[PDB]
Structure 1
Amino acid sequence: NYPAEPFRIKSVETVSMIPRDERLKKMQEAGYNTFLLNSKDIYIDLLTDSGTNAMSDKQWAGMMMGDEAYAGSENFYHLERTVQELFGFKHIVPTHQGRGAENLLSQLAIKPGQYVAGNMYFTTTRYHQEKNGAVFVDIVRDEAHDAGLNIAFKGDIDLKKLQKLIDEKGAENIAYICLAVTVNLAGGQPVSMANMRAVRELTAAHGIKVFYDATRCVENAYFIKEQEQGFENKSIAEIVHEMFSYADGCTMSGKKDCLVNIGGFLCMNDDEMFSSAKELVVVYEGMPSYGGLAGRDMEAMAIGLREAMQYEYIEHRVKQVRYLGDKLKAAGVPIVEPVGGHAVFLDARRFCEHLTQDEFPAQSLAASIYVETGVRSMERGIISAGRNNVTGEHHRPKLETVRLTIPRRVYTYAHMDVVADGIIKLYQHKEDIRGLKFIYEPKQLRAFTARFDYI
């Protein structure tokens, strides 16, 4: 039911293995904030799947062949050729990571006063749109806002919401559609191919451009092969290629599904926009021949993008996450459903029902998780939501969760068992989890540097 790793371990990373009492000391000096823990003090780090992937022996061989030239690097040509072959786009501009490509796209395809619509948003993506004068509109289907609703392709765009938006505001004032695969805010939920072709059908009639946020497109491709009828016989690469046939371009973070620790790029088919793309990249990232990346990183990303297409790799990747979610749900632990492609979200509101949201249950759960197991997770509740500095009070989101984000090819099933067994043990005594009070709170981005103490 769950496949073994379709690879061997080539090299390993040393970890501390400090005891529970030491982990408590480390958590106390970190202010009970997992963001302040030192990497060296962590057994299993589920803070993010961004840039934390394990590369292959082929990629590290490519790392030894870094053509570090300012222009005309062989590594760029290999990256360019790979992206044009697997994604099908005409032009590609490398960036140091995905948000670098998003900064370029927002300045190239947005006129001040226009609208941008897409299946929910991301923190950096929404900023570059809003910073450049756009107004974001969420047009995802309403089911994406139900955490417990176990349905497929929860990240599809509602065609009615898109159709109504075009009528009420006009197509000329619509910059583009930002279709993300997968949808991080709904929990890593996929978008069906049928939804993608419908979006292309509707936008093409009004001359409206479509751009993909393809950072986790391979995970999305696997869900299409597994759960959408008519794609069971098609390979991952074939599905990936067809997805992008319904887009005018894309922004990619290689730090995710390209199986590297740094890198991204920007794709598009329009020649004139690509000409302008090369003008802006020199002032933000670098020359269009390297774009803020060392040659060896372009090589590793080009190799990793080809490795991500292996069906066995992506099946194991998703099912390793599914294994963690299934073990938690089989014990009664409340999670967001369905389990996404890259992370399992613990519902801290139900986990810590004896605590109010003002006592930061997700933050206190994450601190308890690390002390019991050595596992770092991310608070994704009231603390991360921040304040509205105009009113001064907290922001209160519907989701008060703890995110267990699985880097690619870094951990085994036995590591997932360590995570699950500690959380399941925590759940059986969940009444002991204590609330936290702010001791230090910074002015902005409090999730990173704030400190707490038990109540």
Structure 2
Amino acid sequence: MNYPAEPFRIKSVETVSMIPRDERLKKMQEAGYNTFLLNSKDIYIDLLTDSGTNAMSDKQWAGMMMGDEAYAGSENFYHLERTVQELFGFKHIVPTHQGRGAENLLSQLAIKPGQYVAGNMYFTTTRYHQEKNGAVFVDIVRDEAHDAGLNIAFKGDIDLKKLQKLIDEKGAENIAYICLAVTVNLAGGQPVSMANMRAVRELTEAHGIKVFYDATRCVENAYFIKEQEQGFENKSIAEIVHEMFSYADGCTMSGKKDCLVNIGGFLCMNDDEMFSSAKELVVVYEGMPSYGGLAGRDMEAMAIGLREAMQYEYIEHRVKQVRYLGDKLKAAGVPIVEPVGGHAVFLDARRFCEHLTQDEFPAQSLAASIYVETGVRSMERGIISAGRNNVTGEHHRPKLETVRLTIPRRVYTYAHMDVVADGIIKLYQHKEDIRGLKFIYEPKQLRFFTARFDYI
């Protein structure tokens, strides 16, 4: 059934400014046409990211009042611990303040310099921590994942042949681990099949290679398996999640995504020796094995939220709400990355703004247009975010020139989705009018965060 009603009601609301177009235009200009510079208080619908922006439940808020704030041995940690062991089925769990804290720990524990880490594409923080610790990254995703127009299921799947080739050519001893991400963010949030997770587990296990999941959107992933993978029709979301992780040696998790919280993450593993070493390192960067840089109340909220995420109707609606936005855009001819993923819709700004060269920052400009026309903030994921080559001074020119409409969980309705869609569709119907942008201030680093622009 295409678009279910919200399987929840509103307990409480977040106050927003409903400032009109003329005032939004002034805010956009004061932000140098960079949506990253906009004030939260000036935004109606904020689709910058689905990270940490989720609406919690009444049950989680009750948990928020029961924070056992002890430095060691907090009841909230034990709740988190037993929840994650039950639901993910790992032996050991170390909390971290969010996903990149867990990635820091994992890559220091699991990588010898010179070794390879192979994955289904990559995410920036994850790959950074791998490389920082001496790894060489190797993309082993299926070639299809790089074709953003290709409508196929389980587009996040690892190519077993590529994995085999890496094993044959570099040797198993020289592969630190396989980093299998669910879903695959860089491909537009594409799911990985259970068949693929099993095949990868089976090949790596034969060579004694470890597999660690980047589990950030593992619940959206489980919903795709439920919906589209033959034989998972009688399985609960919890059963699918538990089976997914049975094919890994551990994971890095951002609770800020699929655990329905505003902060929080953790590291899981099965190996006792690695657990011991991880506990030795968490104290350096995060905090105790029993708080890991989180307040007691946040371990509690994340424990409760991960269990809420198992509800079929919740995750079905989460994914289908994103789908609604994608479908509506596609029906109007708006160019998007296909198929639509679990967490976001990516506009193809290259095609949307065909009259503009990449050097005129079509994605950055389209994101500015969207905020002005609708009060919606979206994220530039194109040439600006790619940054400038420091050696040569040339832009990094990504194949993907996109605007990301990233959907927080349980925050918005289908009517908000219409606001976004109708506005983008209206812009599309006169897309030729969207003006190119030029730098007026460009920092040396992290340019996407603070750069300012004006129209050409």
1:97 is displaced (CA, Å) by: 0.2
1:85 is displaced (CA, Å) by: 0.2
Partner of 2:18: 17
SS in 1 for 2:336: coil
1:93 is displaced (CA, Å) by: 0.2
Tell me how far apart the structure 1 counterparts of residues 442 and 246 of structure 2 sit (CA, whole Å).
Answer: 47
1:3 is displaced (CA, Å) by: 0.1
- 1:287-337 per-position Cα deviation (integer Å, ceiling 9, x unaligned): 101000000000000000000000000000000000000000001111110
- 1:131-153 per-position Cα deviation (integer Å, ceiling 9, x unaligned): 00010000000000000000000
Tell me how far apart the structure 1 counterparts of residues 88 and 369 of structure 2 sit (CA, whole Å).
Answer: 43
1:440 is displaced (CA, Å) by: 0.3
Partner of 2:424: 423
SS in 1 for 2:304: helix
SS in 2 for 1:255: coil
- 1:55-98 per-position Cα deviation (integer Å, ceiling 9, x unaligned): 00000000000000011100000000000000000000000000
- 1:321-371 per-position Cα deviation (integer Å, ceiling 9, x unaligned): 000000000011111100000000001011100000000000000000000
Partner of 2:448: 447
- 1:414-435 per-position Cα deviation (integer Å, ceiling 9, x unaligned): 0000000000000011111000
Tell me how far apart the structure 1 counterparts of residues 360 and 177 of structure 2 sit (CA, whole Å).
Answer: 41
Tell me how far apart the structure 2 counterparts of residues 74 and 378 of structure 1 sit (CA, whole Å).
Answer: 38
Structure 1 moving runs of 4+ over 6 Å: none
Tell me how far apart the structure 2 counterparts of residues 403 and 353 of structure 1 sit (CA, whole Å).
Answer: 18
1:173 is displaced (CA, Å) by: 0.5
- 1:18-46 per-position Cα deviation (integer Å, ceiling 9, x unaligned): 01000000000000000000000000000
Partner of 1:123: 124
1:387 is displaced (CA, Å) by: 1.2
SS in 2 for 1:185: helix
Tell me how far apart the structure 1 counterparts of residues 228 and 430 of structure 2 sit (CA, whole Å).
Answer: 37
Partner of 2:161: 160
Tell me how far apart the structure 1 counterparts of residues 199 and 20 of structure 2 sit (CA, whole Å).
Answer: 54
Tell me how far apart the structure 2 counterparts of residues 245 and 351 of structure 1 sit (CA, whole Å).
Answer: 42
SS in 1 for 2:130: helix
Tell me how far apart the structure 2 counterparts of residues 129 and 116 of structure 1 sit (CA, whole Å).
Answer: 7
1:111 is displaced (CA, Å) by: 0.5
**Identity between Structure 1 and Structure 2 (%):** 100
SS in 2 for 1:333: coil
Tell me how far apart the structure 2 counterparts of residues 218 and 316 of structure 1 sit (CA, whole Å).
Answer: 12
1:241 is displaced (CA, Å) by: 0.2
Tell me how far apart the structure 2 counterparts of residues 86 and 335 of structure 1 sit (CA, whole Å).
Answer: 34
Tell me how far apart the structure 1 counterparts of residues 231 and 41 of structure 2 sit (CA, whole Å).
Answer: 47
Tell me how far apart the structure 2 counterparts of residues 331 and 183 of structure 1 sit (CA, whole Å).
Answer: 26
Tell me how far apart the structure 2 counterparts of residues 114 and 397 of structure 1 sit (CA, whole Å).
Answer: 27
Tell me how far apart the structure 1 counterparts of residues 72 and 437 of structure 2 sit (CA, whole Å).
Answer: 53
SS in 2 for 1:266: strand
1:319 paired to 2:307:
no
SS in 1 for 2:178: strand
- 1:182-216 per-position Cα deviation (integer Å, ceiling 9, x unaligned): 00000000000000000011000110000000010
- 1:352-398 per-position Cα deviation (integer Å, ceiling 9, x unaligned): 00000000000000000000000000011000011111111001111
- 1:86-127 per-position Cα deviation (integer Å, ceiling 9, x unaligned): 000000000000000000000000011111001011100011
1:445 is displaced (CA, Å) by: 1.1
SS in 1 for 2:186: coil
1:251 is displaced (CA, Å) by: 0.4
Tell me how far apart the structure 2 counterparts of residues 132 and 72 of structure 1 sit (CA, whole Å).
Answer: 31
Tell me how far apart the structure 2 counterparts of residues 359 and 318 of structure 1 sit (CA, whole Å).
Answer: 33
Tell me how far apart the structure 2 counterparts of residues 350 and 112 of structure 1 sit (CA, whole Å).
Answer: 41
1:113 paired to 2:114:
yes
Partner of 1:376: 377
How many residue pairs get matched?
A: 455
Partner of 1:309: 310
1:169 is displaced (CA, Å) by: 0.2
User: RMSD across aligned C-alpha pairs, in angstroms?
Assistant: 0.4
Tell me how far apart the structure 1 counterparts of residues 276 and 235 of structure 2 sit (CA, whole Å).
Answer: 35
Name stretches of at least 5 consecutive residues in structure 1 with no aligned partner.
none
Tell me how far apart the structure 2 counterparts of residues 129 and 317 of structure 1 sit (CA, whole Å).
Answer: 31
- 1:203-234 per-position Cα deviation (integer Å, ceiling 9, x unaligned): 00110000000010000000000000000110
Tell me how far apart the structure 2 counterparts of residues 449 and 223 of structure 1 sit (CA, whole Å).
Answer: 36
Tell me how far apart the structure 2 counterparts of residues 19 and 198 of structure 1 sit (CA, whole Å).
Answer: 53
Tell me how far apart the structure 1 counterparts of residues 274 and 360 of structure 2 sit (CA, whole Å).
Answer: 49
SS in 2 for 1:274: helix
SS in 2 for 1:226: helix
